[PDB]
Amino acid sequence: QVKEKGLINNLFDFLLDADHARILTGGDRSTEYGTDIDELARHYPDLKANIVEALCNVIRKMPSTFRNEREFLFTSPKDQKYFFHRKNEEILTDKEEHEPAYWELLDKGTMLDTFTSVLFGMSLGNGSFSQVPQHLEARDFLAIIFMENPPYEYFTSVAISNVTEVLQYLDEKYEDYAFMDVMKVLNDQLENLNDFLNSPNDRSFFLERDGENSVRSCHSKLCRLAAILNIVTNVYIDLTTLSCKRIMQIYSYFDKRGFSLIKNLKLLFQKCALEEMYIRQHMPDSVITETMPLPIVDVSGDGPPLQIYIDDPKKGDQKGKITSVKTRNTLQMRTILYTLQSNTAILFRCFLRLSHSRNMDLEHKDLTTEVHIFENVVENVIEMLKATELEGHLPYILVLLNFNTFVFTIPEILQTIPAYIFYQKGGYLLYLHIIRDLFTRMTKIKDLSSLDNINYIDESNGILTLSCLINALTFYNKSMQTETMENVQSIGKYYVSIDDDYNIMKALTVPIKVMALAMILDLDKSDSLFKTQSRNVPYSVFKQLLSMLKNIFTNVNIYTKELYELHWDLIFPPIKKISLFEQVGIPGDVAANYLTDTGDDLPADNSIGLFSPEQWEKYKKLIGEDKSIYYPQPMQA
Amino acid sequence: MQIFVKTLTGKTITLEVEPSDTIENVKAKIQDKEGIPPDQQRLIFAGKQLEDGRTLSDYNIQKESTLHLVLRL
Amino acid sequence: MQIFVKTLTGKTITLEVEPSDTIENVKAKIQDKEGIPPDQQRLIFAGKQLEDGRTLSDYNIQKESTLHLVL
Amino acid sequence: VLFTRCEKARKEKLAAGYKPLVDYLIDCDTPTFLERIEAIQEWDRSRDDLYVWIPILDRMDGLLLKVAEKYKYKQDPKKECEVKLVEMEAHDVDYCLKMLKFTRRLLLNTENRFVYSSGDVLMYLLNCPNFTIKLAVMRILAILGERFVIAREKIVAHNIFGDHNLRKKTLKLALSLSSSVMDEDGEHFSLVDLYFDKKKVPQKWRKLRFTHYTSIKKVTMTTQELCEHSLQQIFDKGMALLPAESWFDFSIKASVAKAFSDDSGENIDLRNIIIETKLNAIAFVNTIFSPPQVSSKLFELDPYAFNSLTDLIS
Amino acid sequence: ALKRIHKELNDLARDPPAQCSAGPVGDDMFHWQATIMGPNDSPYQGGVFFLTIHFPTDYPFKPPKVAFTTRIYHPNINSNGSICLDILRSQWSPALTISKVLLSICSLLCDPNPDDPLVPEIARIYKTDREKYNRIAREWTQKYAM
């Protein structure tokens, strides 16, 4: 009777009603309900099919119940503007609650909380829920997690926690069920933000567009993206979650989908930092301290983006004293930007780590893909650093330097291969230029006694300059001591057409020392670092310089005649020569075999006879005037 | 035939068994429906435990008969 | 009946015992299979140390039971 | 109280259903609000969650303070000054009782009462020499704390049980009178006997004799003098001969003596009020003291409490 | 919670970790006694440590109370037996199992957390002198764990 009448369908259909879902409370009770349904499935295997079918049907039906319940950003009554525009503005000082709470008051909010708790309970059962991957594609499962236009607090909610547990269970059981789909969702969401990501970098996007519906649309997009990024970083791509299968999946995704994701993430972090900086430059300081996003429920604050307070953060109780519509809008915006930046930084660190987490052996294709990912990430980081000038953007530059330090380190020791690519692309020269500019700027500071009393970080120009200089010097120091660099093997792993195999870490250590010593000598020539008759540099900066000197005068057991650029396509067997052979017509396997046998040497003549007449003509035509681009080249001074 | 097993720490479950089935088969089915390993399972019928080597017909367990499940350490 | 005895500091073995056998008899069999005298053997099961004066029936040790040895 | 986001949302949604009731008791002026709360006697529904009544409680807590500050019962920590033994006007006594009795009724017909946050208003009003207000405050305090012994833990939002001053005041109140005494004739007299004619009130209870140590300050008042003087007059007399710290204690003993000085209707009513306050104080101290502490502090000092309690419930 | 504790004990019984063992105390399934063997290449290696586990009435929705009955030397472990572990304080989830808790504790034994310790003295001596910390841990284990 139960099977025919479909009572199992009724066991789930009530979860689509807001009242019943709220009554279930979406916690403990709902988990117990899910476990009870799982036990019902277990006791009557005849009912497992019906239970799974009902669950899939309700999952498919749930998105149709979503609707635009209300609005979360409200224009100010006085000027019809969402956000402040001047540091001297006034505050309406309403009596509303200081921090808005929308998610739990929405019908879909409580509905999703309860439904995800039920799913978490069923997963805890470890019974019928294992069969949901069948006859329910992940493209439909994700349709309920990432709904359109969620509140700013959605990414931090019970629904997201339960979804994280459920997706972790599914990933552990079904490795390739949803990872590709969620990555596609993230990439598409980033693409939809093309207008916001590609906006001019000289001004705030929101403040420029303040007072228009575009602000609300972009904020909804950013909230959805924040939820997506939180899910991605908590479930799939995490240093603790980086399994061999996970790394292979990442390689496959980047191989068959391109690297637009890396550029989009770079743009996301850059624009979020720029928006935070510019917005902070137009709000009264009281609002700045009233809308600090750091105290999120489960962030812990460690890692980027760096937080630049105005009042000492060890006092507390600084939030909630003053509130207003503009204040609440600013709080929501800053929270979203902070979470986006933090998740992007975590993703970049994971991308720079990849296989080195397990030290697993890699085939040629996997190694090439890994080096390609490293190259893309490092070039994007260097572009981000180069984009903005250092004058007037000190908070943004400080955030950028902290992000660079966090990304290029292991939870710390430098990531040797990403750092090698960073050096080859001119990153360390850029750091040296930034350090010299910051030193010249520091010499202009009126007094240095205050700089030695840095209990915290402020927006003052002097303290920001000191923090930037210290961060840059620390990053430079960490790249000169072999004790704080990942011990990757010699360059022989990557190239065969080299003069001498050298250890990558020790070989890299030399040029950094040369550059640092040259910079110190140049500073001396300016009669700034030494020869002075007064304490013209704070204690921390001089301690960092002394550490740099000590490291520079430390000995390493290599000679390092010269260094070879690390290119993904030139790793033996080089992909350039193989691609040329494929263009000719020879299969890739034959090309690789010939290259291995001949020790990475082009066929000067067809005496070997493996080129057809027409193939030989095409080969001679397509080589090009220059044959040096098919071999590693030394890195210029 | 169909028999019932009452878990003193839960609900009742139904088993499709035959009189010739040994107590080991019943224990395996109970594990399948609940997950308790057979060695941890103690079965009681009419106040007397049951030996794994004997069959249901030996203990005079018939259709609709309800056994009790207890666990002992 | 057969019992399972894993040596945390060594290898695993299987023995044959009876319910009435005391833990001292089990330790003697462990010595015979390995050599270490009972006084030095440390027996653990269900998170509790096993006493020589006791027996399997008192400890409710069942067939195929897995015990741990520390030596 | 602090609620998780889900709990706060659930509570707000639940309270949304009581909006007509809240508007009923919040959109009216003070006299109408009083005459409306005094009309809420019986509960025709399951025990409401106290959270939905927060708007009402605050309003009441707003009014009580205006009476606590008017008579200066609000003890100022910034000043070591004590509280003068000044009685409340009958109008103000009725005004405060109308709300205290309703608070009792509400706390009886609700759960999740840890949200109750007035707390300090009861502490201030306990200083009122008038014994009706003392009885009402003690009743409310006894209903509270009962949860704190049933659960023994959990956030309470008033935590007035920790204060040692309240503990001392409650212990003094519970020890007012004695459950059993040895009259001059040598015949046992228990307070229950006050409601039977088979015995006479002991002469010890009919006279006031208070002694405090700074050097020993004594106040003695015979039965005739107590009959002549009014309660406020007795408070004024004692206040002029004793240190501030002892005043509260005296305010009890004097009020007891004046109660037993004569067998008039007002004196009988005051006797009943004092006995009820004693019982409620016993109930409260039984919930904010460990069993051995209660035995060492109260029951050993008042051994005949249990027998009187059992005799009074038939 | 009984249905959950039953399957937890069954999972431990089926494939118990050789590093640790546990079971009910006096047939009170909410009270468990557990045994841990010191991790290899650690100052506590070769020892035996007893722990008492109490399961809340709302298990697994609340973390179990695990206390070190046996005296031990560690920055995050107090002599009274209280444990300072993330999964038992803030990172608790119903998905976790007692076996996973035991494995995490065993890992923490050889991987202390000086930056967030429970007893300041042990953390300070650890930071100042690793060798002295190893020596004192070895001596304490020999005194009590052995």
mmCIF file of C-alpha atoms in Angstrom, chain A residues 36 39-40 42-45, chain B residues 11-14 32-34:
data_model
loop_
_atom_site.group_PDB
_atom_site.id
_atom_site.type_symbol
_atom_site.label_atom_id
_atom_site.label_comp_id
_atom_site.label_asym_id
_atom_site.label_seq_id
_atom_site.Cartn_x
_atom_site.Cartn_y
_atom_site.Cartn_z
ATOM 1 C CA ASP A 36 15.351 8.005 10.238
ATOM 2 C CA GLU A 39 17.046 3.668 8.388
ATOM 3 C CA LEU A 40 13.602 3.222 6.831
ATOM 4 C CA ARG A 42 17.728 0.161 5.105
ATOM 5 C CA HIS A 43 15.018 -1.863 6.858
ATOM 6 C CA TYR A 44 12.971 -2.218 3.643
ATOM 7 C CA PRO A 45 15.313 -2.520 0.636
ATOM 8 C CA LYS B 11 12.250 -0.585 16.491
ATOM 9 C CA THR B 12 10.995 -3.893 15.094
ATOM 10 C CA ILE B 13 12.229 -5.451 11.850
ATOM 11 C CA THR B 14 10.880 -8.208 9.610
ATOM 12 C CA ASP B 32 22.167 -6.820 6.996
ATOM 13 C CA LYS B 33 19.072 -4.978 8.236
ATOM 14 C CA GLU B 34 20.802 -3.363 11.254
#
